[PDB]
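Internal ticket - ligand job 1009, 3-beta-hydroxy-5-androsten-17-one:
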Amino acid sequence: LDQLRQEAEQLKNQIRDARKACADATLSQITNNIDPVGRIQMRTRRTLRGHLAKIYAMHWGTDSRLLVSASQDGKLIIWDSYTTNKVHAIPLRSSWVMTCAYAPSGNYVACGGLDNICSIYNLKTREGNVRVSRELAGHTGYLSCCRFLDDNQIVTSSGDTTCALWDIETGQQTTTFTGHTGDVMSLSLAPDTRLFVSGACDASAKLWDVREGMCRQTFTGHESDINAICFFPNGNAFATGSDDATCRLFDLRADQELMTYSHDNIICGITSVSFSKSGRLLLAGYDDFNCNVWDALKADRAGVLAGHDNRVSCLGVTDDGMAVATGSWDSFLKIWN
Amino acid sequence: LSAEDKAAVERSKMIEKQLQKDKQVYRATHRLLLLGADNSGKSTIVKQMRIYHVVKTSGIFETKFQVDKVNFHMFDVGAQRDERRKWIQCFNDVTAIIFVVDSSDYNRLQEALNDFKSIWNNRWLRTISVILFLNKQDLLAEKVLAGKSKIEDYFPEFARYTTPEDATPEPGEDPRVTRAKYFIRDEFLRISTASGDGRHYCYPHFTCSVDTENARRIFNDCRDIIQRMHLRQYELL
Amino acid sequence: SIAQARKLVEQLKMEANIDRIKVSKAAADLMAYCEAHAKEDPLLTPVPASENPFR
Amino acid sequence: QVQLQESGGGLVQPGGSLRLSCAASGFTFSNYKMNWVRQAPGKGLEWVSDISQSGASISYTGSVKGRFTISRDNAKNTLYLQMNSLKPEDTAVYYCARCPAPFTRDCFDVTSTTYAYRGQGTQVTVS
Amino acid sequence: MALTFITYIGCGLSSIFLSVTLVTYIAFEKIRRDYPSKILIQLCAALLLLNLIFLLDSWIALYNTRGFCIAVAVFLHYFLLVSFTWMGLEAFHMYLALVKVFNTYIRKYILKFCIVGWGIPAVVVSIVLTISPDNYGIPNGTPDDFCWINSNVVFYITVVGYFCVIFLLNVSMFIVVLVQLCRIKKKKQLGIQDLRSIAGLTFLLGITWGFAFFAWGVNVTFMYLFAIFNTLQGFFIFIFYCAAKENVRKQWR
Ligand SMILES: C[C@]12CC[C@H](O)CC1=CC[C@@H]1[C@@H]2CC[C@]2(C)C(=O)CC[C@@H]12
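stdout (structure tokens):
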């Protein structure tokens, strides 16, 4: 510790100098000849209601039709977005769920919360009633996010500053990703399911490797807690929403700052971040009851999604990109197209 | 409307019915968040209310107690890290926050004051009333009667403090005990009545370990909280 | 602690050896992906209500 | 990234004055409520003082009401703590901590262990 | 001839501002989530219907036909009873929010209130019609040619007695609310919004309808006072419950 601190400081200085030398021109002047997105107007095509307490998590399905929503009344509801029909109202043992995931195959739904347990529910079962398939209890802190990897592996970030890749069939924790000093708030899987980024309570996001968990990269550009994270569609970049009322677009294999999405009249922190189908639009939900839409390549607001009383706390974009569904703390889901 | 679509809608309505049955139970019960450090007799209070009226790394422990045929669901955190910045936002819709404070020891008294200040002035925790419990008044009685620990050592303002005229004396209590007890209560109330502006209100109590009236006190304070909320709906407050 | 500092310095040593591309090339790749997939973006270009399935 | 560097503080006679400086980098200093905490040997983290944005809400703990003062310079990106008269009891490691979530009134878990937005700290020994 | 002009202008102002209140509360669903607003909209609609039908009955000199006069008298009586029942229902609601505070949830609260608010007056009107349809042929009416109850024997039970029960309940709940307010204001912790809001409660509960006792005896000044506040009940409700709320004004812009 006598010289380890100094060595770490000088190594960080060297990394910063390398990053500075690696930056020729920022994204501002690179995308200077691109025509603007052009004042996107989006309206509430669907309004989904039936949750009692605040809706705190949601996740779109791969078919872009069914979406799962987890609300703090201990309720897990799968909605058919087209007909606004709710399927599989799943009751939870712990009414403090903070995250929900929908398996890519659509056969399982994950939910976790303050009970330190990730419950995997089997949607398609012979008996016909949804039941808990597997309870994963290895974390010592609240589960903030969870994402299905291959219908048998699940990556869950907890409040004990650790991520964990599990093995649902055996119920044991396969790999543990450590390195965060603050509790991890969100995680996003890469399109190829070989990488994933995690944003925690520190000013840093970490790109890990699911195969061995050796934590390739760390990006430090924010100033407060990072509440949301999501890759670009191509998997070579990701956007982070933090608590300092700013969004930031980092790029893999460059370790750089591409864009900062913020405005002077914005003071509430970001809560959820998602991308459009082509990655041109970045949909960010805020604590001022809005879902400001940004042009990713030009960093200017393109549209605002009103109609929510409390904070949004969750939003997702369909795999085909037809619609965007935003939850809220007023217990109402809004689907926009 | 296809025949398959008819069944899908019919299943949803048979879902809607269950959700309506669940809403009857969710609204009947009042959820209470129980805070407090390790020194406070939080576990003793939990045990007292659990026995009186009706898992290795669990993050939340839930106890439900029914008084006057109304149910209260009280949650205290278990295996959670000391950083409460994030998971405290999950309790924005609780009826009240039971803030138990060990009034005996003073090495961490100011820590409890800072915890109360942080809870009070929180954007997502505003409009939530706190049922402040000043537990273990007996231990404070012996500690202040022996005259071994001086209050002005930790809080210098105790020297220029006198018991308020509105303070109700406890029979058989020495004036020094009452003065110190009400000094602690007023020290908490000073933070309480500084930014609430009628949105939320604090309910101090001089609880002990022997006493069994904690459930009744919580019931009365929750009744007052809901009455104030309903009056605020009419903008009467 | 000594172990924590050792782990941190080893992590920084590992992170200081990866090769990174110039920011201009990454920006060009981002533009190319956002230009070659614009036609497939329903939110970018609003489709007529005929094939829009959310009425 | 966010980094807080503490300077000043060390061996001092019981009655001297020490100035503790804290240089902040990686964030907009004026938008956060800066703090000052201490950890005595074997006593754990203990809150000492805090100051809101551009001052105007200076507060202290009971033990140092009349001795310690806290100021900040947003232009110089610095937070200062002046200790006019030291006692042998308050020898400790002092940490310049920063509240999270800018533009806020509360300040959560600053005294919690492994707080992210906390400096390395400086040792102050009084004897 | 000053009573007619003041009554007309009061009813017209009440009608227009009640229509404004209904359109504001219906077009904007962000300010009608709670039960008090869902009862306020019903009461405002009932009062708007009452004022409109009273204006129509006063203005139209239909003292020749037996059908239209009876129909308008029946509908005016029904709307009066509906307004009284809705004020009583607001009082009963505040009983379930301040006196009995626990276990107050019942399925379809507003539906069960609308069943009673528009149902019991309908039953009373149906009974008074089926006993004698001529009871509404040709005193609350200004001249002797005003379509109104002519029995003067069912007028006491169907109007006065109903109003007496409603007024007793409303004044009891008003006293209870005042008691709670006074208790709260006398809990000093360490050492015009209140008066503006309480007047809104007074007009919402129809306490000003109690001047009818003093106008029965006579008491020309009390008669004028009764004629002024009661007709302006809708306008005052709009002032103290639509414009007074800050969220409504913010959402207007
Ligand atoms: C005011 C009121 C009763 C209340 C109505 O809103 C308006 C109405 C006009 C005619 C009045 C009547 C009260 C009783 C009166 C005053 C009579 O006996 C002569 C005319 C009658």
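Auto-summary: Chain B has one domain: 29-217. The helical segments of chain B are 3-28, 42-52, 109-120, 137-145, 151-154, 175-192, 214-233.
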